[PDB]
Amino acid sequence: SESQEDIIRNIARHLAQVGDSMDRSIPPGLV
Amino acid sequence: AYSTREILLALCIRDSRVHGNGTLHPVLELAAREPLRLSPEDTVVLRYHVLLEEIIERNSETFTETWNRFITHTEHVDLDFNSVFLEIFHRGDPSLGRALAWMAWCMHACRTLCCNQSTPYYVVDLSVRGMLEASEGLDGWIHQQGGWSTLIED
């Protein structure tokens, strides 16, 4: 690890979690 | 027919006017000239400014850690912005919640760069460019969904 590309990738997935957490609520409400 | 580049820049201009008022950063002024027909005061911008701020507050500890870590390790901030984006929206399928999270993370990035008398200009410049050109990857999937304005107005 401890690579400049591993640290960028690790940040991208942290944000994807935040996003997915939010997106869990939209589908079930629409239909 | 506003694009992501425009609504994002407007949000940062809107967010800069709300925090301490003061002069708008020359980089942001120039980006509004090099374009931005959407006023920072426009209703759609006011709606999104509230929403994205709530996202930042709810994920405050994560948005600071990830950003503080991002800025202190990158050597090409304009390129690493597109790297993060492609991981979220190209290596995976777009989501409405993933788009809001990205937009909120970029608005939080500017907040830490807008009104600081110690942040170098070349740092602010590459960061503003990294966001706006990397956020173009959402225009496609979002016009399919009806556009930013329609997404929030319900």
Author numbering:
A (entry chain G): 76 to 106
B (entry chain A): 2 to 35, 37 to 156
What does the literature reporting this entry say, word for word?
Epstein–Barr virus (EBV), a member of the Gammaherpesviridae, encodes the Bcl-2 homolog BHRF1, a potent inhibitor of Bcl-2-mediated apoptosis. EBV BHRF1 is a Bcl-2 homolog that potently inhibits host intrinsic apoptosis via direct inactivation of cellular proapoptotic Bcl-2 proteins Bak and Bim and selectively interacts with a subset of proapoptotic proteins (Bid, Puma, and Bax) to regulate apoptosis.
For the BHRF1–Bid BH3 complex, a clear and continuous electron density map was observed for BHRF1 residues 3–155 and BidBH3 motif residues 78–107. Furthermore, these hydrophobic interactions are supplemented with two ionic interactions (salt bridges) between D95Bid and R100BHRF1, the hallmark of the pro-survival Bcl-2 interaction between a conserved arginine in the BH1 motif and aspartate of the BH3 motif, which is found in almost all pro-survival Bcl-2–BH3 complexes and R88Bid and E89BHRF1, as well as two hydrogen bonding interactions between D98Bid and G99BHRF1, and between R84Bid and E89BHRF1. Residue I83Bid occupies a pocket formed by BHRF1 residues F72, T76, and V79, all residues highly conserved or conservatively substituted in BHRF1 variants. A comparison of the BHRF1–Bid BH3 complex with KSHV KsBcl-2–Bid BH3 or VARV F1L–Bid BH3 shows that their mode of BH3 interaction is nearly identical, despite having significantly different affinities (110 nM, 20 nM, and 3220 nM toward Bid BH3, respectively).
